Design a binder for this molecule. Sequence first.
Ligand code: ICS
Ligand code: CLF
Ligand code: FES
Ligand code: FES
Ligand code: CA
Lengths: 121, 121, 522, 477
Amino acid sequence: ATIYFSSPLMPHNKKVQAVAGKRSTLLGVAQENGVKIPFECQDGNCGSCLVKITHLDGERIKGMLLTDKERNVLKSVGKLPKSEEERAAVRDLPPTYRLACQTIVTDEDLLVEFTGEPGGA
Amino acid sequence: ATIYFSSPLMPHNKKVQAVAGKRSTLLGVAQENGVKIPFECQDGNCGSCLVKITHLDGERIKGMLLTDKERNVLKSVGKLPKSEEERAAVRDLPPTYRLACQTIVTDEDLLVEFTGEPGGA
Amino acid sequence: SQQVDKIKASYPLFLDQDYKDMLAKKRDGFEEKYPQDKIDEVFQWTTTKEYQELNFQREALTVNPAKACQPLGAVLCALGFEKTMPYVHGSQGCVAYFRSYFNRHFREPVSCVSDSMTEDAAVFGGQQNMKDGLQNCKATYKPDMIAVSTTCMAEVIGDDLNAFINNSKKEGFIPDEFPVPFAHTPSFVGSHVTGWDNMFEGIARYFTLKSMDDKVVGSNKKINIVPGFETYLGNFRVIKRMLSEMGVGYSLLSDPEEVLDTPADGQFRMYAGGTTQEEMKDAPNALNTVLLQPWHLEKTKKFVEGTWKHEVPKLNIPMGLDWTDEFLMKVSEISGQPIPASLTKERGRLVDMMTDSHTWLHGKRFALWGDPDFVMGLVKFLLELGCEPVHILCHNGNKRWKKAVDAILAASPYGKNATVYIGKDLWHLRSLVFTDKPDFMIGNSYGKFIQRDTLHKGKEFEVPLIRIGFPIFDRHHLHRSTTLGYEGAMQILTTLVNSILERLDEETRGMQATDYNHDLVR
Amino acid sequence: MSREEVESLIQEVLEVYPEKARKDRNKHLAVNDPAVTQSKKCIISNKKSQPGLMTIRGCAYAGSKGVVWGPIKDMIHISHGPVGCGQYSRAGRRNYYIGTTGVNAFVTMNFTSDFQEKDIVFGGDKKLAKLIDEVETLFPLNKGISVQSECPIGLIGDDIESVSKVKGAELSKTIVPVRCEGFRGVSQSLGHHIANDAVRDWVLGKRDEDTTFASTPYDVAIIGDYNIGGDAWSSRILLEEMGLRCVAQWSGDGSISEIELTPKVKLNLVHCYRSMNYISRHMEEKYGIPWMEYNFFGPTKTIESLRAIAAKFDESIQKKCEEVIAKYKPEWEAVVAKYRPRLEGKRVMLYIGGLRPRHVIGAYEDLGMEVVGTGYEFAHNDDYDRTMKEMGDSTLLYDDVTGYEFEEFVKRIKPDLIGSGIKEKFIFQKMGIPFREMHSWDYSGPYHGFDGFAIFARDMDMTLNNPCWKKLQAPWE
Ligand code: ICS
Ligand code: CLF
Ligand code: FES
Ligand code: FES
Ligand SMILES: [Ca+2]
């Protein structure tokens, strides 16, 4: 899997090769490769590691489980519209906004964008 | 080179393998792969094939020549801020907005985004 | 087409001409199947001695294993106790597979619960799953004890069961006096028999470790019996009937015979019988503890010797004549009760049965496989009958067990061509029976395909399968059989001799070709 | 029973649960209203399972290896991880096939890496390569390898995609890594999604640039029929007596070549929507192949589905469909005449995985049997949208039912017959209530088509009217 980290803080987007399905959840990848996503909790109930993930392959998007913890955190932050929640619940497709501490890397090309700010704003 | 075409019109982003430096100028690639960027001229003075190109590799951005025709068209459309024009003129770095019929593909990973609309709006 | 008076199921409906034509068209047009000559060449190649040499050089590939994971045995051991709910801390597919396996083997309801851990539990641990599962399990099914095992997810993650349960009791999810024994049962270490040992050791720890000060060895004048991973209700019943006839006071720890066999009388009983918690608390007060299957109860032996101070006698599994005699003599020595006449007569009847059927069993070559204790007991009994166990296999075996089995074989002329294998699967056994053909096979239901492989080569190369072991899926109610003691020896002898006679009858039924040997009296 | 009695029963059952579990389980139970089209107003689905409540769901590994990838016969399916997952799912599913097992077919064989503790600590990416080499050495006639991941694989961080790519480049063999860890999904449905994604990304597109296949306007493919007890076969003949040419079956009695030839057809007939809609939509989007859902349970549904499929084609196909219906009419009429009087008015409660709780309702209706309750294990809201138009008014609906909930519902309603899996068979057989395995057809079948309807009726009659259900009560009690 190829992950392209982009952010206003980063001078350039960073291309990273990652192993799919590891217990490290794309935070581990960011911390290994020096990408600084704000992670400020250890349970998963804050929104700091909020990122926007774009599937660059389009025809290679994998099915995933949107856990109730991540769904509730995204709804508390306000980055989970009703349509995307319904799509995740019914068709098992990931939403556009994810939490970088709970997102398991899949075997595809992804563009991860963050603002260096907590999830809420 | 890997080019990811993204657009609201397209149901999914399309990944395309392309040969760098061909006389076909990323329009040819789009027309070969079925991507529908609005091209409505044959000389290069309209803004229709305006796209936004993001270099996903960041540390692999290649130097390029911003021809006065493309620069004038971008300034007529209004997608060439003074800072990016100065950067292109001095440091030979490409701007964020390009014209898909005058953009020569380089050996890097690119994300090309269009709105299915002419350049001006 | 179907006829309303002669309805045909999948066999032999698909043998009709229309179905044959449809399948032939499918295969010819779209399957791109290899030519039948290539298939026949490859099949004959697999039966050669050259293929066996490549097969036995396998180091990373396992084909048709002959073992399961630890939590299966852990679940069985948990079911062994009274009002005990097996609770597997991990993903929920494991529990479904365990229940399906045990339902297909015993054809009786099996009750187990899970924490239904998921991707959030893989990242942040499964402590909340533990708390909620314990609370829900105690509230809904109302058990008197919850016995916690682990899958391979919880082990790889590194979930601390003791911490999770202690934090669950102090938080108020379950009362502090509610017994929740736990055990770590990694599925990548050992097999299903090891999980039974780990679960029993954990339960014994939970019930006896903190109260050994006021325990005197011999207070209740009883003997503890630890059966182990046993999948025959008849073994549980015979191991209690023999002691009851003997007059010995006994306490069967982890007895699932009652829950795994309940009457069909209009009501469903989730719990039945089982060892009570009082028996587990009083276990250290017993005269001595006997492990029926000592080759997978090693950790339990360590705990019993170190903590309970009981000097566990070194006995073999009561399979056969000599080992049953040794077990009875050791029990008589420990309890002081003389062996009654009702067991000497049974031994004499078994010897009479052996003498009557020795002319058919002598010289027969058998290939066997299964659990270490069961396999070694079966090998000893076969040696007592004059049979030749040419191929001996035990996927979940160690080198000390192999050495013991070799020592047993060397102490008998018939254990001359025998070869013991450990770490080998059923594909190795298929290769072995093709090149060194035995007369029969003794194993679980997974050995039927091997027989089908031997028939394809030819009727003269077919190796019939005798189903003794676990699991048995293609036969009904064989789990009620017995393999321990004299009664089990009688049943095994009957099965072996009747399988031999049935095969002989099948080979000599062709009229005017081989039916001259179709003797009425055989 | 009316809507008032059923809701009282639902509340009484839920009274024993803890308050959080009670609130969660109240959403998954409902009383059917056929006028409701949006099931989300009534029933929630595809949610996690409440811990410790003894659910009946499975894992993503069961959904992928057990259900989708397993029936493929010409491939070899490695179970990467410990022994248990592969051992328990071996030959437990009656997906029939034709081949020489161990030579060119490998459905009922268990290939596993058999992880030890040294592989959990030091990884298993070299063991996988050595295993692939040994598989190529010992089974030369295999047409592909699929590595199904078990639970430890994702947790220890093993890169199997790289191994698959390297060994496929080396051996020129199709190696498909499936990340079907058991913890990745709440049930088997995500296993279906993962398996369909693997098929799409590693197998389906091999012959995109090949045009040597001779296509016809009558080419179709059977999707989501796994040939339980021969079911797919009983369907395939019914689709070839109408002149259509079934190019591929997914996946019962299927081969890796039919999967690759599937994009060369003119219509996809999807039997199980739940497990194969993911690939049906992908094929419609990419290759333009339309797809439609058909039901071959019972005579009525079979006739309706055949008429629809014929309507998808020209007039000759419709004439052949009418000929087939006329030919098979007396056969199922005789079965109905014989068995309906015996099975008239009986009440049934069903609980199956994701498709059959609504598909087999038509078969029970044709025998005069009323389904007084149905439910799924891992169905989504779509499935309940389709279900609400099938069930009668005031009939009970449940989702991911527990042992307690199902037992209490059965005790109050007292159905004449129950259809569910092996894990509930003996629970209700000790209660004196006839039970039919609706997963494996109770080792009988097939049940699809007109040939399977006779078997269906015979089995239902032999189980409901068996003389063994009158003897449970001892005469001296
Ligand atoms: S695949 Fe699915 S549980 Fe559609 S996982 Fe399950 S052989 Fe069921 S209701 Mo077993 S979605 Fe098939 C099923 Fe239905 S294994 Fe079979 S019977 S029609
Ligand atoms: S949820 Fe599914 S079936 Fe479970 S382990 Fe995981 S992939 Fe497999 Fe496997 S060996 Fe035994 S049965 Fe389990 S504890 Fe591991
Ligand atoms: S860092 Fe708290 S939610 Fe990811
Ligand atoms: S199309 Fe006119 S500018 Fe490119
Ligand atoms: Ca029973």
